[PDB]
Amino acid sequence: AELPPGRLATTEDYFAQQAKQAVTPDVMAQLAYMNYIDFISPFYSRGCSFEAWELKHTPQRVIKYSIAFYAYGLASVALIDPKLRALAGHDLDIAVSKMKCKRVWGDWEEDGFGTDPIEKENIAYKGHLNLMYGLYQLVTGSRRYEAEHAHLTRIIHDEIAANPFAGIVCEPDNYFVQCNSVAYLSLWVYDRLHGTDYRAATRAWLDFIQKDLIDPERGAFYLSYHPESGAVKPWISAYTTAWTLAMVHGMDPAFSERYYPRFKQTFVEVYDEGRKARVRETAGTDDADGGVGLASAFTLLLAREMGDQQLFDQLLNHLEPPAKPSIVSASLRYEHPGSLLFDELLFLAKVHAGFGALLRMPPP
Amino acid sequence: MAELPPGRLATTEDYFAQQAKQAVTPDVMAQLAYMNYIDFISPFYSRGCSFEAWELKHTPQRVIKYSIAFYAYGLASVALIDPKLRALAGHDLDIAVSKMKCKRVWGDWEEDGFGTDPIEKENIAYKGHLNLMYGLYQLVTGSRRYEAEHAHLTRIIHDEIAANPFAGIVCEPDNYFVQCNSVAYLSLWVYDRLHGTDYRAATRAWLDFIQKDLIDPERGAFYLSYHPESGAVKPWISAYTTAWTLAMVHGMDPAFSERYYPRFKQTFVEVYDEGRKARVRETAGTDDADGGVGLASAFTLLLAREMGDQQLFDQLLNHLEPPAKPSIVSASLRYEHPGSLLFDELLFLAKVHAGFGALLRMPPP
Amino acid sequence: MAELPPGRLATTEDYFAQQAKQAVTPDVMAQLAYMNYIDFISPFYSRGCSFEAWELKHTPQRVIKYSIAFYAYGLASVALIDPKLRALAGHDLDIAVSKMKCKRVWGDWEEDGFGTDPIEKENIAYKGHLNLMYGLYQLVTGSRRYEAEHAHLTRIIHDEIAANPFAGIVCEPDNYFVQCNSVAYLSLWVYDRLHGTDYRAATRAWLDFIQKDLIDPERGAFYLSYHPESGAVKPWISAYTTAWTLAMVHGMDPAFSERYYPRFKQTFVEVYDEGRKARVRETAGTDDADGGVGLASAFTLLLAREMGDQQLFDQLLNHLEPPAKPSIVSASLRYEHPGSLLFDELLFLAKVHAGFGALLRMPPPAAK
Amino acid sequence: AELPPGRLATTEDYFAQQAKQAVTPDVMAQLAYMNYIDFISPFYSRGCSFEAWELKHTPQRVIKYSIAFYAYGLASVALIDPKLRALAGHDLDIAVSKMKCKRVWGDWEEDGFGTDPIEKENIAYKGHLNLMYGLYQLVTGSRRYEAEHAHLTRIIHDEIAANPFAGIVCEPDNYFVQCNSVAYLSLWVYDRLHGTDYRAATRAWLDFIQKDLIDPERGAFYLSYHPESGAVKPWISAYTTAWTLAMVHGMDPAFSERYYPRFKQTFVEVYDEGRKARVRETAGTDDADGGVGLASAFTLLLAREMGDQQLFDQLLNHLEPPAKPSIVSASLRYEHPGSLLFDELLFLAKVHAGFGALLRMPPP
Amino acid sequence: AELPPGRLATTEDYFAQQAKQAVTPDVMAQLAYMNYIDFISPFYSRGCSFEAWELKHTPQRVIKYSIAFYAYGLASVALIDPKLRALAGHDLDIAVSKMKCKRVWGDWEEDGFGTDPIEKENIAYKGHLNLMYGLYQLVTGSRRYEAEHAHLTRIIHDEIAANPFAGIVCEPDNYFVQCNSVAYLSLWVYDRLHGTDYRAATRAWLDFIQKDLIDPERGAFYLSYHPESGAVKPWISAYTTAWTLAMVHGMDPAFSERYYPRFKQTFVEVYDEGRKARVRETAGTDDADGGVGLASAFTLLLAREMGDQQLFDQLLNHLEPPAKPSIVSASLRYEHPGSLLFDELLFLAKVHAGFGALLRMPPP
């Protein structure tokens, strides 16, 4: 394939990494950014230092998501190159240590919701942590976190079982389909490691979200659900849908395959003579990447998850060149990241092997 | 009017027809998107004691209680306009009551050294708005989530009125404002409507009392404030004081507002630009518009809406909205140059307001 | 008939005629609007311990007590000018006493390590003004709201005077200033008017003491300060010190001030601009105006009003007001470029000031 | 005598102040700066308020020296104009009060050396405090600090007696001849007031500093001595030498008279056709006023103490004009003070009657 | 030898310092920077004052390395000039005192790792402290810290003896060869002072670091080791290698002699017609001095250690001129330091007599 202007590698080369059992030079240079420099690299230390996040101005509320998306990408690195599996394991150990620091979960207390980030609700945080415990153990074969993983999985299963709707809230009375999708995927990973059947609750969840929470004609989820009133916020969200369909594809591929083409019709604008694409965050607008500004970046991951090389290429042509990447001393930096979680999501999308393939990761 | 004036988002006829068509205009929907859409920073994201939405628009602490109350009054009319938005409006009103109880909102009462309990006595500015929000939440949703608190706060207000030698309650100790009383008395009308009680009976003594030292009947205007310890009435008339008070009273005694409304307009409203616009003088003996707190024009927009005055509504919105430079980006409404405090709140409320009488008569869910 | 000078809001004739016409000038009414109008940020919005008005004008913490006191002194004269405004003056004065008692105002006493109680001993800068304000509040309102505190503070002041070997009371330990004493003594005259006591009897000994080493009688000017531990008098004369002291002493011993006033003018006052303007040197051996704290001209405006010197009042107001760029926006007064601390306070007080003697003799209020 | 460009008064006028029993108008304007304006003048209040030093941006560690040097100048004012002796005594009472505030000595604790600044060592602080006690009592005849003075003098005498080298350190293991010189002068002032013989220890100290601590060829002291190691830092210091010789001239005039010509030869650069002088801080350089930047200012004091009118004029012609003095409302300010302790040291040099003449101050 | 452009002294003059028994005038001006100015010179006081490091903006985490590098230089100054041996001893006393201030070690606690910086792990701090204890005693012959030295050496020996890998970690689970190299050298110094055999553990360490931790053909260490996972971060580090080979050369000169020419092949770029050289920090890049930016500075020290005058000259021609050195008042300053630890590492490189020579230092 031709290398498009301002791109670091072809779409062909990203998709061929697993078959070639090697990451591209630019993915290796991202792993150098993540690992190389003393003190300021994100995976320097298991300690509760956040220098790397302070230098890139990560908002405190988003650090949990930065760590989790790096972790999901490290899981795929483990599957692509057996020679990097040991380093991916070490990084996932650090990702879990950091994820447990109060800098990361502390907004739960500061917002007045409680002192224990695990106890009830707060699925945004404990969903990602529970999936990271699982991915760490698939990659390493280590039981370092097994006691905590066993405990968190049961709290999540108990909370689902107790609730009259299918799933768990974040803040009291804030239900989001995307944070539930991570928690359910965390049960599939636990079942793969332990031979359990926590994943059985998934069928009732996929029935529930296909009623009030989706517009099936547009293949788009509504912004949020609030059980106390039963209110559904009447705006569809592209970044919400992209994330949800990506994770659900690892659990019920038919569900995400049913809605993906309607999702693209609803939100994806192809432009620049077919070379590029950008994603509208909601209906009734021409504007790309409104709201949190992550529709195009989450759609890049969804395109990778669904095997859509054409939309992957169009989106990366939109996202990467204006961010002006360069490799200095074999380490990747972007001069003009276009969004929150920018290096994280471009990393994850370049390497992502599929949530199903991570579930079925062979032992070391 | 049916032509779209320059810089306007929708016609005056469109705002006034929302209830008949059982749909909000797209710009009102885009305001509801501003209020509800973006994680953490939207004002109605969470019931938590987070105020990011207010930090980002530099709302002064002492005004946050007013921002929340005005959003709440707007959301009660949205519930009446479009039955499909009623559950969302109930949700937002639940968040508005929760936030209203955060110490960031009422904390000025302690920090000014007046006490540690914002409802115990006085402080009618804060607890009048809270008590009206308890009522409007329960009319919109039929939920009794707040009934215990509502039953308590209504009785504290009724007891304080009954105990005072003057009709009503003070804010700070010894500071009486007619506009903050007007909200407290409306809260008793809403409680009575829900419970079949007669707390609203004290209204007649109040309406009799404010028509004495506190109003200029000829100019149809209220003086700034009353100070019972000294007997002092501050000797300046206030448009924003008058506009807000006439709007709320029109819900309880429409004849009272109808008598003073035309004289209020003569006293304060400047029509300009060949009849296309209007701006409101805050006090007498000046040519300057929107002096003082800067809210005379905005509160007159609400009054015009309440009184069914489409011409003045159009004129005021032509003055207020275009220079604020509205735009809709990703189906969400933003103003580049808000002209005043409480700007999106008061323009939202005025665009949807069904009338305080219609909110009192709101059918069940 | 009188001509409105360039940049002025009203003639000197109009300010001096307010009491006779029983009405403040529109610009004085617009100052009372500034003080009373806007929720939260107007200085007399609430009796609470909020200082938003003083934050907005960058008033240094140490000067807030003076700002409140000078507002109070003006409001007392407003009560005298226009009976219809007397209730409003009374309400503002109630607020001024409440704010005066907030620790934001008196707190410097603790912060500098002098003690936790601002009225116990010394600190005459604070409790002189507070004692005078207790008095004027009661003269204006006829209210006994603060009578208990006033009786206490008056007796603490009299006791401390009686117990010192010099005539009067210090501010900081070992810092004696005639200007802060003049306020304390005037507070005893006001208590005496209200209660038919004779605390004012100590005034004679004070007027004899301040005319030994504390004055240059030939130049009609007080020295900066006295320090009883050493017996040192700082050897510089001060115009703002003298202007303030003579204005207050004129309400107690008019002959004392009538004696020194012409020498004070020759020493300090520079008439300029073909006789239209005047500015005041702060000390001797300089051509420079308004040095030091920078209040010589503004305190001399008050003195000119107190002495009935319309010519010097006009000249000083022609120097002070036009460069401050006054404007009335929505019937409320603002200065773009205040020339000094306490600027709107001291111009308000000078425009309305009925004389400290007239304040002493204020008739009681009309019944409810 | 001709007034040089940018000068306020002639060298002749400064040196004739005591004979005329009057300070120059410019020294009077400095006393106005020190005393005039409420709260911000350095001598407003005996309280622990340091507004004046905050506005000049005095470093915390330097406030103790600024107070001492004002005090040394106020002692000479007392001798020059009897009419100003009560003012100088008042100012000296404030100087001593302020000297005892934690803002002034608190570096001793912050640096972890102790919570009591007079207990042991710390001679920089307590040598200046002890001299100030004595000068306050010579000027005023007041016994207000006599108890403290009697205690501090004995603590200093005890520490000298207990040390195997002649003198006392500042920080532990840091010996400086210039901070010792102040401590020894304080013993001469206590002896003048009480008839004691604490000054007897001075001959041993002068014998000592003339061994390892001085360079006899250059008439210059080395920067410092370090007892634990025996190290003498191998650089000569002009500001060290000027201050030390100025103070020693009050105790042993022949000593300062012996080194003074060599000191000038070594450090003093005459320039501008004989009109100006500037002082090198160390050997092996052409640069003036390196190090702490006080060589020229302390040499102005030394020239005054030694009666050297020519070098006094040359140094003040270098120091004062560029600092752009002005007298506004009979008060002195410099727009461009060229060093730390600038107004303090120019005040002191202008008034200084000699440490010997301060020793012999007749009573009030 | 010709003085190259922008240089203060020839390479010939640096290397001949020991033979001439004198430091160059620029090395003496660096010692004047380190010692001269009251309060702000780094070696002014033994107390917990860090103004010198505040003024150059040293990151908190780098201060320990700044003190140790100065210490390593001062030890060679002792050997070069007997007349400066006492001043060097005094400075090393201060270096050890400052090293024990919580400003220096406090990050151990701040990062959640413990309240005691020497109890376990944290080899980066206690390796340097232990080397400094030993170098202080070699230069001075003082037993002032012998109790602490005997304690710390034993803690280091016990922790080596307890680990299944050869050596000790920094943070938990962070193993760096360069930080170990300092710890082992500290044992050689202890053994030199006491006749003990703690250095016997070195052979197992040198065997361990030549397995997965080195690319023997490129003469380069990988960035780090992480025993819990067994991961080696898969990037070679020039700065890691230059520091490690320098310290090892004093313990096993054959080890460093074998790798040095392969190291230079791998990382060193000679440019400007053979006159200059700059060092690449990792493989697969043309960029010089990436990462922590110290590759060139550490290679300067290694060239000095290996007696490679040609590469020393080339590196100093790259590092020193762009930094615009000047001598003002006989004190050295750099207008544009090119890196962290700049004046520290150029001082050490200029004086370094070799770690082997410091081991063999004869008594005072």
Side-chain angles (χ1 to χ4, degrees), chain C residues 234-265 267-278:
Chain C
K234 288 190 184 182
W236 303 273
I237 63 184
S238 159
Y240 104 90
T241 298
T242 309
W244 183 351
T245 302
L246 297 184
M248 294 235 158
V249 170
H250 179 263
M252 297 182 279
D253 185 3
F256 180 111
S257 299
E258 257 124 46
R259 174 186 174 197
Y260 290 121
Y261 183 50
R263 301 170 205 188
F264 165 86
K265 296 197 287 174
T267 302
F268 293 123
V269 174
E270 183 202 350
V271 175
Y272 76 100
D273 188 44
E274 306 297 318
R276 293 182 288 259
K277 304 184 186 205

Side-chain angles (χ1 to χ4, degrees), chain B residues 43-83 85-119 122-203 205-211 214-228 230-273:
Chain B
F44 292 86
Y45 174 64
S46 155
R47 49 197 322 126
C49 290
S50 46
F51 288 91
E52 276 133 304
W54 289 268
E55 292 159 20
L56 288 171
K57 68 206 252 185
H58 314 281
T59 312
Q61 185 275 143
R62 289 182 195 274
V63 165
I64 300 178
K65 58 175 71 77
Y66 297 113
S67 164
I68 298 165
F70 295 142
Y71 277 135
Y73 307 157
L75 284 167
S77 286
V78 168
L80 196 54
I81 285 157
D82 187 350
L85 291 180
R86 180 152 184 175
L88 170 70
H91 171 70
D92 285 349
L93 279 164
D94 186 3
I95 288 164
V97 173
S98 315
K99 287 213 187 284
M100 191 71 173
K101 296 207 276 148
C102 300
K103 174 161 188 161
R104 175 61 182 169
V105 176
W106 60 259
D108 52 290
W109 183 252
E110 209 175 274
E111 293 187 31
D112 288 1
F114 295 121
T116 61
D117 196 351
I119 67 174
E122 309 162 326
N123 201 26
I124 198 58
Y126 172 74
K127 71 195 197 193
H129 286 279
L130 182 52
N131 203 48
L132 185 48
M133 295 166 58
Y134 282 147
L136 295 169
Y137 169 77
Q138 187 166 342
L139 280 175
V140 167
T141 67
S143 171
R144 303 183 296 105
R145 182 172 213 319
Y146 296 113
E147 194 172 310
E149 300 170 38
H150 191 206
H152 173 87
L153 184 47
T154 293
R155 283 170 179 80
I156 288 182
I157 297 172
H158 164 82
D159 286 338
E160 227 179 319
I161 294 168
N164 285 324
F166 52 85
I169 309 174
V170 309
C171 288
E172 296 85 16
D174 196 40
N175 276 0
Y176 185 106
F177 300 91
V178 294
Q179 69 270 39
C180 300
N181 278 280
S182 82
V183 174
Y185 281 84
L186 191 56
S187 80
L188 310 182
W189 285 71
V190 177
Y191 189 90
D192 287 353
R193 164 79 207 286
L194 289 163
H195 297 297
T197 47
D198 202 27
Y199 290 112
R200 75 193 181 282
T203 309
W206 181 68
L207 291 175
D208 294 338
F209 167 71
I210 63 192
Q211 278 180 292
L214 275 157
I215 210 180
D216 187 334
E218 290 292 304
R219 283 184 302 179
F222 293 103
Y223 290 100
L224 190 57
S225 54
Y226 164 77
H227 305 88
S230 64
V233 174
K234 273 183 195 196
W236 306 274
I237 55 166
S238 159
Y240 102 86
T241 294
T242 304
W244 179 353
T245 303
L246 290 197
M248 295 249 159
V249 168
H250 182 72
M252 294 178 275
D253 181 7
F256 178 114
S257 291
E258 288 167 19
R259 159 182 204 267
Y260 296 122
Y261 181 52
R263 303 171 201 175
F264 157 93
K265 291 204 296 188
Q266 195 94 95
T267 299
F268 295 122
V269 177
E270 190 199 338
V271 171
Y272 74 103
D273 192 41

Side-chain angles (χ1 to χ4, degrees), chain B residues 62 175 234 240 282 288, chain C residues 36-37 39 45 52 91 330:
Chain B
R62 289 182 195 274
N175 276 0
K234 273 183 195 196
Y240 102 86
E282 173 46 22
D288 303 314
Chain C
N36 281 282
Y37 199 96
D39 296 308
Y45 172 64
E52 268 112 330
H91 167 68
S330 193

Side-chain angles (χ1 to χ4, degrees), chain D residues 1 4 7 10-12 14-15 260 264 268-279 296 299-300 302-318:
Chain D
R7 283 282 293 280
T10 61
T11 295
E12 181 176 70
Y14 291 127
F15 274 73
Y260 181 51
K264 290 197 283 178
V268 171
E269 187 204 330
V270 175
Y271 76 101
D272 193 43
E273 311 294 332
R275 288 180 295 256
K276 298 174 167 71
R278 53 186 167 222
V279 188
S296 292
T299 308
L300 183 75
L302 179 53
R304 189 70 153 101
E305 171 70 44
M306 300 313 281
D308 190 350
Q309 285 181 222
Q310 177 170 59
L311 178 58
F312 182 98
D313 192 69
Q314 292 170 330
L315 286 171
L316 194 52
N317 288 342
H318 171 73

